[PDB]
Design a protein around this nucleic acid. Sequence first.
DNA 1: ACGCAGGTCCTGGCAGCTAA
DNA 2: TTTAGCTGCCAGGACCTGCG
Length: 139
Amino acid sequence: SKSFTCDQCGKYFSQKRQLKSHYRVHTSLPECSHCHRKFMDVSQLKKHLRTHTGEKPFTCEICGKSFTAKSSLQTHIRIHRGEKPYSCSICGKCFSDSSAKRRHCILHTGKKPFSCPECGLQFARLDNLKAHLKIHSKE
DNA sequence: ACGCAGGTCCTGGCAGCTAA
DNA sequence: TTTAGCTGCCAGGACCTGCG
Ligand SMILES: [Zn+2]
Ligand SMILES: [Zn+2]
Ligand SMILES: [Zn+2]
Ligand SMILES: [Zn+2]
Ligand SMILES: [Zn+2]
């Protein structure tokens, strides 16, 4: 039987100490000593430390470029192989990169939630508002 | 003559498996 | 058997880039 339940997510636990440890994920969590960012688990903190190091241990066998993560390398490989598995249901365009497909499908919605604070022009992507504000920086 | 969007890789989050 | 650590996989984002 499980008698200790979490308030926010509702998970059950056999002992209260296990509930106290889990509840730190809704609040004392592991924190990076350099940038002071808090992380859910300890393994995620471990992987975050590699961003401070700058090391790239996953090397592409074809071109020789290296990546900070193994899923980045798998994605990169599909570019070499011309594999485009992700396709837009509406416009039919295909992508090797799953984030490129996701970003593309937002355009079919026409939502523009980023508006320029100087001139009021609306943007669908935050990157494009960033560049437009650079133009406003004349002098 | 600049907004638009596609290319490319970096970051962090969980589910599920697996080693301690 | 329990549990912590590990991996795959994924959503989101930043930065560059040429096109119309
Ligand atoms: Zn909870
Ligand atoms: Zn840090
Ligand atoms: Zn390559
Ligand atoms: Zn489309
Ligand atoms: Zn503006």
